[PDB]
PDB file of C-alpha atoms and ligand atoms in Angstrom:
ATOM      1  CA  UNK V   1       8.397  -6.010   1.444  1.00 13.96           C
ATOM      2  CA  UNK V   2       6.613  -7.103  -2.011  1.00 13.97           C
ATOM      3  CA  UNK V   3       4.203  -4.194  -3.208  1.00 13.33           C
ATOM      4  CA  UNK V   4       1.475  -4.268  -6.188  1.00  8.51           C
ATOM      5  CA  UNK V   5       1.044  -1.345  -8.144  1.00 11.86           C
ATOM      6  CA  UNK V   6      -1.538  -0.894 -10.697  1.00 13.05           C
ATOM      7  CA  UNK V   7      -4.493   1.569 -12.506  1.00 14.12           C
ATOM      8  CA  UNK V   8      -7.659   0.484 -12.057  1.00 10.62           C
ATOM      9  CA  UNK V   9     -10.962   1.228 -14.164  1.00 10.41           C
ATOM     10  CA  UNK V  10     -14.369   0.490 -12.103  1.00  8.36           C
ATOM     11  CA  UNK V  11     -15.063  -2.635 -11.141  1.00  5.13           C
ATOM     12  CA  UNK V  12     -10.726  -3.080 -11.402  1.00  2.70           C
ATOM     13  CA  UNK V  13     -10.452  -2.956 -14.721  1.00  3.84           C
ATOM     14  CA  UNK V  14      -7.027  -3.595 -15.117  1.00  5.18           C
ATOM     15  CA  UNK V  15      -6.851  -4.158 -18.950  1.00  2.49           C
ATOM     16  CA  UNK V  16      -8.147  -5.165 -22.433  1.00  5.36           C
ATOM     17  CA  UNK V  17      -8.409  -6.454 -25.695  1.00  2.27           C
ATOM     18  CA  UNK V  18      -6.624  -3.448 -26.609  1.00  2.00           C
ATOM     19  CA  UNK V  19      -4.790  -0.191 -25.417  1.00  2.00           C
ATOM     20  CA  UNK V  20      -7.118   1.251 -22.485  1.00  5.07           C
ATOM     21  CA  UNK V  21      -8.850   3.825 -23.240  1.00  6.19           C
ATOM     22  CA  UNK V  22      -7.167   7.179 -21.455  1.00  5.06           C
ATOM     23  CA  UNK V  23      -4.316   9.414 -22.222  1.00  6.02           C
ATOM     24  CA  UNK V  24      -3.226   9.674 -17.228  1.00  6.03           C
ATOM     25  CA  UNK V  25       0.663  10.886 -18.104  1.00  5.43           C
ATOM     26  CA  UNK V  26      -0.123  11.816 -14.037  1.00  3.35           C
ATOM     27  CA  UNK V  27      -0.530   8.725 -13.202  1.00  3.50           C
ATOM     28  CA  UNK V  28       2.161   7.374 -15.605  1.00  6.81           C
ATOM     29  CA  UNK V  29       4.373   9.372 -13.259  1.00  5.66           C
ATOM     30  CA  UNK V  30       2.754   8.508  -9.898  1.00  4.42           C
ATOM     31  CA  UNK V  31       3.679   4.868 -11.884  1.00  3.31           C
ATOM     32  CA  UNK V  32       7.239   6.111 -12.296  1.00  2.83           C
ATOM     33  CA  UNK V  33       7.743   7.793  -8.961  1.00  3.66           C
ATOM     34  CA  UNK V  34       7.023   4.775  -6.938  1.00  4.82           C
ATOM     35  CA  UNK V  35       8.428   2.601  -9.210  1.00  5.51           C
ATOM     36  CA  UNK V  36      12.389   4.568  -9.626  1.00  9.14           C
ATOM     37  CA  UNK V  37      14.990   2.411  -7.931  1.00 10.29           C
ATOM     38  CA  UNK V  38      13.753  -0.102  -7.488  1.00  8.85           C
ATOM     39  CA  UNK V  39      12.814  -4.059  -9.402  1.00  8.63           C
ATOM     40  CA  UNK V  40       9.844  -4.771 -11.522  1.00  8.70           C
ATOM     41  CA  UNK V  41       8.693  -8.305 -12.473  1.00  7.17           C
ATOM     42  CA  UNK V  42       5.815  -8.497 -14.727  1.00  4.31           C
ATOM     43  CA  UNK V  43       4.252 -10.850 -16.510  1.00  5.55           C
ATOM     44  CA  UNK V  44       4.768 -11.082 -20.574  1.00  6.34           C
ATOM     45  CA  UNK V  45       2.451  -9.267 -21.427  1.00  6.16           C
ATOM     46  CA  UNK V  46       3.022  -6.769 -19.653  1.00  6.84           C
ATOM     47  CA  UNK V  47       6.300  -6.590 -21.437  1.00  5.83           C
ATOM     48  CA  UNK V  48       4.658  -6.628 -24.608  1.00  8.48           C
ATOM     49  CA  UNK V  49       2.172  -3.798 -23.890  1.00  9.40           C
ATOM     50  CA  UNK V  50       5.339  -1.567 -21.997  1.00  8.76           C
ATOM     51  CA  UNK V  51       6.821  -2.311 -25.792  1.00 13.75           C
ATOM     52  CA  UNK V  52      10.399  -1.091 -24.404  1.00 15.04           C
ATOM     53  CA  UNK V  53      12.697  -1.651 -20.234  1.00 12.43           C
ATOM     54  CA  UNK V  54      11.553   0.408 -18.162  1.00 10.45           C
ATOM     55  CA  UNK V  55      14.277   3.645 -17.101  1.00 10.83           C
ATOM     56  CA  UNK V  56      15.879   2.930 -14.063  1.00  7.20           C
ATOM     57  CA  UNK V  57      14.692  -0.107 -12.893  1.00  5.62           C
ATOM     58  CA  UNK V  58      15.965  -3.965 -12.944  1.00  8.48           C
ATOM     59  CA  UNK V  59      13.231  -5.130 -15.062  1.00  8.50           C
ATOM     60  CA  UNK V  60      12.120  -9.207 -14.192  1.00 10.72           C
ATOM     61  CA  UNK V  61       9.427 -11.009 -16.603  1.00  9.38           C
ATOM     62  CA  UNK V  62       7.846 -13.970 -15.273  1.00  9.69           C
ATOM     63  CA  UNK V  63       7.085 -16.351 -17.940  1.00  9.92           C
ATOM     64  CA  UNK V  64       6.891 -20.406 -18.338  1.00  7.62           C
ATOM     65  CA  UNK V  65       8.559 -19.790 -22.464  1.00  4.16           C
ATOM     66  CA  UNK V  66      12.267 -18.571 -22.178  1.00  5.92           C
ATOM     67  CA  UNK V  67      13.103 -15.336 -23.396  1.00  2.42           C
ATOM     68  CA  UNK V  68      13.256 -12.993 -26.235  1.00  2.00           C
ATOM     69  CA  UNK V  69      15.272  -9.517 -25.497  1.00  2.00           C
ATOM     70  CA  UNK V  70      18.707  -9.833 -23.553  1.00  2.00           C
ATOM     71  CA  UNK V  71      17.943  -6.353 -21.917  1.00  2.00           C
ATOM     72  CA  UNK V  72      15.609  -7.981 -19.072  1.00  2.00           C
ATOM     73  CA  UNK V  73      15.471 -11.021 -16.500  1.00  3.15           C
ATOM     74  CA  UNK V  74      13.512 -13.511 -17.536  1.00  3.24           C
ATOM     75  CA  UNK V  75      12.219 -16.066 -13.929  1.00  5.09           C
ATOM     76  CA  UNK V  76       9.682 -19.208 -14.769  1.00  6.47           C
ATOM     77  CA  UNK V  77       8.506 -18.861 -11.157  1.00 10.06           C
ATOM     78  CA  UNK V  78       7.360 -16.832  -8.375  1.00  8.93           C
ATOM     79  CA  UNK V  79      10.214 -17.768  -6.180  1.00  8.27           C
ATOM     80  CA  UNK V  80      12.722 -16.919  -9.058  1.00  6.26           C
ATOM     81  CA  UNK V  81      11.517 -13.401  -9.598  1.00  4.51           C
ATOM     82  CA  UNK V  82      12.529 -13.134  -5.852  1.00  7.96           C
ATOM     83  CA  UNK V  83      15.609 -14.065  -5.581  1.00  9.17           C
ATOM     84  CA  UNK V  84      16.308 -12.533  -8.956  1.00  7.34           C
ATOM     85  CA  UNK V  85      15.839  -9.057  -6.681  1.00  9.64           C
ATOM     86  CA  UNK V  86      18.071  -9.940  -4.428  1.00  9.99           C
ATOM     87  CA  UNK V  87      18.036  -7.494  -1.014  1.00  7.61           C
ATOM     88  CA  UNK V  88      16.225  -4.079  -1.546  1.00  7.63           C
ATOM     89  CA  UNK V  89      13.599  -2.867   0.885  1.00  9.22           C
ATOM     90  CA  UNK V  90      11.262  -3.301  -1.521  1.00  8.73           C
ATOM     91  CA  UNK V  91       9.853  -5.297  -4.831  1.00  6.95           C
ATOM     92  CA  UNK V  92       6.994  -3.593  -6.967  1.00  4.86           C
ATOM     93  CA  UNK V  93       4.627  -6.107  -9.128  1.00  4.53           C
ATOM     94  CA  UNK V  94       3.419  -4.445 -12.104  1.00  6.30           C
ATOM     95  CA  UNK V  95       1.014  -6.522 -14.043  1.00  6.29           C
ATOM     96  CA  UNK V  96      -1.276  -8.178 -14.993  1.00  4.25           C
ATOM     97  CA  UNK V  97      -3.839 -10.200 -13.307  1.00  5.62           C
ATOM     98  CA  UNK V  98      -2.249 -13.525 -12.976  1.00  4.99           C
ATOM     99  CA  UNK V  99       0.887 -11.815 -11.854  1.00  6.31           C
ATOM    100  CA  UNK V 100      -1.168  -9.890  -8.834  1.00 10.88           C
ATOM    101  CA  UNK V 101      -3.245 -12.639  -8.577  1.00  9.30           C
ATOM    102  CA  UNK V 102       0.222 -14.746  -7.565  1.00 10.02           C
ATOM    103  CA  UNK V 103       1.700 -11.786  -5.310  1.00 10.58           C
ATOM    104  CA  UNK V 104      -1.212 -10.445  -3.975  1.00 12.18           C
ATOM    105  CA  UNK V 105      -0.860 -12.639  -0.765  1.00 12.98           C
ATOM    106  CA  UNK V 106       2.408 -11.434  -0.200  1.00 13.27           C
ATOM    107  CA  UNK V 107       2.260  -8.303  -0.503  1.00 12.51           C
ATOM    108  CA  UNK V 108       1.806  -5.794   2.570  1.00 13.97           C
ATOM    109  CA  UNK V 109       1.182  -2.776  -0.245  1.00 11.69           C
ATOM    110  CA  UNK V 110      -0.697  -1.833  -2.900  1.00 10.75           C
ATOM    111  CA  UNK V 111      -0.542   1.803  -4.715  1.00 13.22           C
ATOM    112  CA  UNK V 112      -3.308   1.614  -6.673  1.00 13.01           C
ATOM    113  CA  UNK V 113      -4.768   4.266  -9.407  1.00 12.77           C
ATOM    114  CA  UNK V 114      -8.623   4.372  -9.639  1.00 17.96           C
ATOM    115  CA  UNK V 115      -9.850   5.732 -12.436  1.00 20.23           C
ATOM    116  CA  UNK V 116     -13.607   7.140 -13.624  1.00 20.24           C
ATOM    117  CA  UNK V 117     -13.782   5.259 -16.805  1.00 16.92           C
ATOM    118  CA  UNK V 118     -16.363   2.465 -17.184  1.00 14.29           C
ATOM    119  CA  UNK V 119     -15.149   0.357 -19.555  1.00 15.29           C
ATOM    120  CA  UNK V 120     -15.904  -3.420 -19.907  1.00 11.72           C
ATOM    121  CA  UNK V 121     -12.377  -5.220 -18.582  1.00 13.64           C
ATOM    122  CA  UNK V 122     -11.275  -8.329 -20.572  1.00 14.15           C
ATOM    123  CA  UNK V 123      -8.324  -8.716 -17.243  1.00 12.91           C
ATOM    124  CA  UNK V 124      -9.156  -7.454 -13.396  1.00 11.31           C
ATOM    125  CA  UNK V 125      -7.722  -6.786 -10.154  1.00 11.47           C
ATOM    126  CA  UNK V 126      -7.889  -9.152  -7.665  1.00 11.64           C
ATOM    127  CA  UNK V 127     -10.577  -8.848  -5.511  1.00  8.74           C
ATOM    128  CA  UNK V 128      -9.465  -7.646  -1.957  1.00 10.48           C
ATOM    129  CA  UNK V 129     -11.317  -7.157   0.631  1.00  6.89           C
ATOM    130  CA  UNK V 130     -10.716  -3.467   1.314  1.00  6.47           C
ATOM    131  CA  UNK V 131     -12.256  -4.197   5.442  1.00  4.54           C
ATOM    132  CA  UNK V 132      -8.475  -5.774   5.440  1.00  5.26           C
ATOM    133  CA  UNK V 133      -6.028  -2.759   4.171  1.00  4.28           C
ATOM    134  CA  UNK V 134      -5.765   0.851   5.881  1.00  2.07           C
ATOM    135  CA  UNK V 135      -5.874   3.113   3.307  1.00  2.79           C
ATOM    136  CA  UNK V 136      -2.827   5.972   4.338  1.00  2.00           C
ATOM    137  CA  UNK V 137      -2.633   7.734   1.478  1.00  2.00           C
ATOM    138  CA  UNK V 138      -5.803   9.448  -1.041  1.00  2.00           C
ATOM    139  CA  UNK V 139      -5.146  12.280  -3.550  1.00  2.00           C
ATOM    140  CA  UNK V 140      -8.107  13.080  -5.753  1.00  2.00           C
ATOM    141  CA  UNK V 141      -7.582  14.609  -9.009  1.00  2.00           C
ATOM    142  CA  UNK V 142     -10.201  16.014 -12.278  1.00  2.00           C
ATOM    143  CA  UNK V 143      -9.561  15.225 -15.185  1.00  2.00           C
ATOM    144  CA  UNK V 144      -7.515  18.100 -16.760  1.00  2.00           C
ATOM    145  CA  UNK V 145      -5.669  19.421 -20.555  1.00  2.00           C
ATOM    146  CA  UNK V 146      -3.452  16.566 -19.906  1.00  2.00           C
ATOM    147  CA  UNK V 147      -5.405  13.888 -18.199  1.00  2.00           C
ATOM    148  CA  UNK V 148      -8.698  12.234 -19.743  1.00  2.00           C
ATOM    149  CA  UNK V 149      -9.929  11.396 -17.004  1.00  2.00           C
ATOM    150  CA  UNK V 150     -10.171  11.983 -13.138  1.00  2.00           C
ATOM    151  CA  UNK V 151      -8.517   9.715 -10.803  1.00  2.00           C
ATOM    152  CA  UNK V 152      -7.649   9.183  -7.352  1.00  2.00           C
ATOM    153  CA  UNK V 153      -4.076   7.860  -6.021  1.00  2.00           C
ATOM    154  CA  UNK V 154      -4.292   5.624  -2.891  1.00  2.00           C
ATOM    155  CA  UNK V 155      -1.774   3.569  -0.874  1.00  2.00           C
ATOM    156  CA  UNK V 156      -2.523   0.975   1.567  1.00  2.00           C
ATOM    157  CA  UNK V 157      -1.386  -0.651   3.875  1.00  2.00           C
ATOM    158  CA  UNK V 158      -1.579  -4.482   4.835  1.00  2.00           C
ATOM    159  CA  UNK V 159      -3.653  -4.494   8.066  1.00  2.00           C
TER     160      UNK V 159
HETATM  161  N1  FOL B   1      -0.581   3.446 -11.914  1.00  2.00           N
HETATM  162  C1  FOL B   1      -0.392   2.546 -12.890  1.00  2.00           C
HETATM  163  N2  FOL B   1      -0.214   2.585 -14.215  1.00  2.00           N
HETATM  164  C2  FOL B   1      -0.295   2.217 -15.194  1.00  2.00           C
HETATM  165  O1  FOL B   1      -1.103   2.092 -16.306  1.00  2.00           O
HETATM  166  C3  FOL B   1       0.297   1.143 -14.866  1.00  2.00           C
HETATM  167  N3  FOL B   1       0.354   0.087 -15.811  1.00  2.00           N
HETATM  168  C4  FOL B   1       1.060  -1.162 -15.962  1.00  2.00           C
HETATM  169  C5  FOL B   1       1.899  -1.579 -17.305  1.00  2.00           C
HETATM  170  N4  FOL B   1       1.728  -0.782 -17.970  1.00  2.00           N
HETATM  171  C6  FOL B   1       2.507   0.574 -18.741  1.00  2.00           C
HETATM  172  C7  FOL B   1       2.580   1.257 -19.698  1.00  2.00           C
HETATM  173  C8  FOL B   1       3.780   1.933 -19.804  1.00  2.00           C
HETATM  174  C9  FOL B   1       4.508   2.826 -18.494  1.00  2.00           C
HETATM  175  C10 FOL B   1       5.439   3.473 -18.929  1.00  2.00           C
HETATM  176  O2  FOL B   1       6.124   4.086 -20.038  1.00  2.00           O
HETATM  177  N5  FOL B   1       6.186   4.161 -18.003  1.00  2.00           N
HETATM  178  C11 FOL B   1       6.755   5.330 -18.040  1.00  2.00           C
HETATM  179  C12 FOL B   1       6.425   6.246 -17.724  1.00  2.00           C
HETATM  180  C13 FOL B   1       5.521   6.912 -19.184  1.00  2.00           C
HETATM  181  C14 FOL B   1       6.466   7.478 -19.914  1.00  2.00           C
HETATM  182  O3  FOL B   1       7.380   8.267 -19.881  1.00  2.00           O
HETATM  183  O4  FOL B   1       6.293   8.363 -21.277  1.00  2.00           O
HETATM  184  C15 FOL B   1       8.058   5.083 -16.568  1.00  2.00           C
HETATM  185  O5  FOL B   1       8.642   5.426 -16.780  1.00  2.00           O
HETATM  186  O6  FOL B   1       7.639   4.901 -15.741  1.00  2.00           O
HETATM  187  C16 FOL B   1       4.434   2.015 -17.102  1.00  2.00           C
HETATM  188  C17 FOL B   1       3.066   0.648 -17.035  1.00  2.00           C
HETATM  189  C18 FOL B   1       1.420  -1.471 -14.356  1.00  2.00           C
HETATM  190  N6  FOL B   1       0.788  -0.617 -13.327  1.00  2.00           N
HETATM  191  C19 FOL B   1       0.516   0.500 -13.956  1.00  2.00           C
HETATM  192  N7  FOL B   1       0.126   0.711 -12.307  1.00  2.00           N
HETATM  193 CA1   CA B   2      -6.287   6.566   6.291  1.00  2.00          CA
HETATM  194 CL1   CL B   3       2.966  12.026  -9.067  1.00  2.00          CL
HETATM  195 CL1   CL B   4       0.953  -9.536 -18.220  1.00  2.00          CL
HETATM  196 CL1   CL B   5      -8.853   2.966   5.705  1.00  2.00          CL
END
């Protein structure tokens, strides 16, 4: 099964010209909880953003240009990325925009963090029909001493 995991500000904003203007360690901990020991597929901009390989996960980078880091796997097609995951119960697609776009139609599950931030987006999560999805988990949190905005965790399963 393929799943997508994303953090969405208002209007589905997922990325900006520069680093996103929030500080959400609790969301990064949710991200880790749901990706640890699973293969993760990402595009090159997201790979650059993260800075290094995500620990304890097989990192696959989907890209048309040859790779510039030997500590991860570089693939040139969606089907190559999937094959590189081998035989695992769940593949996690971690962005960014174009990669979500490409994997959405194949995905059966979404792990979304909705962040209460009004920002002008450079890239957006795909316009999914919430109509077509079943929320099986939701959990709301206010901003606190460590987290700058209010956010809500959701898991959704393809109806
Ligand atoms: N829920 C969610 N939040 C994210 O911000 C997110 N970000 C991207 C890509 N960006 C990033 C940026 C950093 C890390 C990261 O540093 N994760 C660490 C935990 C952070 C820490 O320990 O300081 C990890 O080990 O997973 C992951 C994804 C894709 N899906 C997401 N999904
Ligand atoms: Ca429900
Ligand atoms: Cl968590
Ligand atoms: Cl990307
Ligand atoms: Cl629902």
